[PDB]
Structures are given as C-alpha cells and as structure tokens.
Amino acid sequence: SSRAGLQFPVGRVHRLLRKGNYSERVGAGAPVYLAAVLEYLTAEILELAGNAARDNKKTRIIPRHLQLAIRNDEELNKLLGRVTIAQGGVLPNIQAVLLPK
DNA sequence: ATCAGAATCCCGGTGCCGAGGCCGCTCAATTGGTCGTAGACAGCTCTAGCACCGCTTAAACGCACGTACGCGCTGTCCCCCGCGTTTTAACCGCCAAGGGGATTACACCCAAGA
C-alpha cells in the first residue's frame, strides 16, 4: 500500500483474491489495481456524502446522506441500480399532476 | 384582493450514549532464497473477412378520400378526505387456594439409664 500510494490494503486484497477461488494464479498488479479502484470509488462516494451533509448542516455522514449522494449522481445510480440502502429513504420527488391546479 | 387560522422552521438548552483518541501484543505482512511452469515472442498458414459486379423484385414512398379512434366538455353521484369517540395491542395489585410454630393450668412424690 505504501509503494503504490494507496490507503486500501494490498496484501489483504491479494489474500482475499487468492482465497476466493477465482483463478489458479494471481499476479502482483491485479490486487493493486483492484485496491486503487475501490479507493477511488470510496473517495467519490464519501466526497458526495460529505457534500450532501454540508448541504444539510450535518457533520456526520448518515445513511440519508449516502442515499442522497448515490441517487443524485447519474453514474452512481446506474452502477447501484439494484442496490438498496438501509435507512436511506428516497428522493423528494413530487409529480406535477399531483400539485394543486 | 384581504384576513384568521392552525401547521412548520429555527433558536436558548442540555446532557448522554455514541463517536473519537490511546496501550499491549501477536498473527498477518515483509524480507531473503530456491524451483519452475505458464507467459511473452517468432514463425507458417489458409480460412475467413472484405470490396465489387450481373440480374432480379417485392418492399417503400407519394397520391385520394373519408372516418373512427382521439380528445375537449358535460350530468351524476360516489367513496374516499377529514374530524370525534374509545378500544384492542399489550402492560402492572389485592382475593382465599395451603406450608407451618403453638397445647393439653399450677406445686410436690415415687422408680430406672448414661
């Protein structure tokens, strides 16, 4: 992790890939790549959640912040389409035909 | 246009259990070395993909006319929209079923074992 400049563990990812019964041999660049991708995804999600929390005057990330960060982003909603977030709720979307005319 | 009215958001205020910081190891991560096979690279090939022509024809577009599905407007009465009353989902103290100490007054005498 220190040689690749990543916060996610490289040895743990390598051990998980070796014990997960995915392939006979595992290279040295695949765990680094997977850890980097996971770290980038986590960083994007956490930044969006922190922005949503700052928009609500909150200092702690709650599942509602994660839901608002995932649903507002198009790519994050496409990647997590069939993903359900517990205690996250939904978006405050009201149809125009239901408003008082 | 205009007001009275219940419903909603932000601020003193507070404290507490969840969020956050620190210590000891020890089992997983790291270093160093010896096998070693799956991976990278060069070579032959012919089959598979690609571009183009000859002859053919049913498919696709413009024309003609109305109409019936498409859609605005109307008469109705309906069954949800919404408030008032407890109640049903559980939460919270005294009866009449029994288990036990206590008694057979008071004072005196005789006989026979450890």
Curated annotation (Swiss-Prot):
Subunit structure: The nucleosome is a histone octamer containing two molecules each of H2A, H2B, H3 and H4 assembled in one H3-H4 heterotetramer and two H2A-H2B heterodimers. The octamer wraps approximately 147 bp of DNA.
Organism of derivation: Homo sapiens
GO molecular function (one): structural constituent of chromatin
Cellular component GO terms, alphabetical: CENP-A containing nucleosome; extracellular exosome; nucleosome; nucleus
Keywords from the UniProt entry: Acetylation, Chromosome, Citrullination, DNA-binding, Hydroxylation, Isopeptide bond, Methylation, Nucleosome core, Nucleus, Phosphoprotein, Ubl conjugation
Annotated protein name in UniProt: Histone H2A type 1-B/E
Residues found modified as N5-methylglutamine: Q87
One record GO biological process: negative regulation of cell population proliferation
N6-(beta-hydroxybutyryl)lysine: residues carrying this PTM: K19, K78, K101
Bilayer-spanning residue ranges: none
Residues carrying N6-glutaryllysine: K78, K101
PTM-bearing positions, type N6-(2-hydroxyisobutyryl)lysine: K19, K57, K58, K78, K101
Entry keyword Transcription: no
Post-translational modifications reported in the UniProt record: It is involved in the initiation of both imprinted and random X inactivation. Ubiquitinated H2A is enriched in inactive X chromosome chromatin. Ubiquitination of H2A functions downstream of methylation of 'Lys-27' of histone H3 (H3K27me). H2AK119Ub by RNF2/RING2 can also be induced by ultraviolet and may be involved in DNA repair. Glutamine methylation at Gln-87 (H2AQ104me) by FBL is specifically dedicated to polymerase I. It is present at 35S ribosomal DNA locus and impairs binding of the FACT complex.
Keyword field contains Acetylation: yes
N6-succinyllysine PTM positions: K78
Compartments it resides in: Nucleus; Chromosome
Role, per record: Core component of nucleosome. Nucleosomes wrap and compact DNA into chromatin, limiting DNA accessibility to the cellular machineries which require DNA as a template. Histones thereby play a central role in transcription regulation, DNA repair, DNA replication and chromosomal stability. DNA accessibility is regulated via a complex set of post-translational modifications of histones, also called histone code, and nucleosome remodeling.
Sequence similarity: Belongs to the histone H2A family.
Modified positions (N6-crotonyllysine) in chain numbering: K19, K101
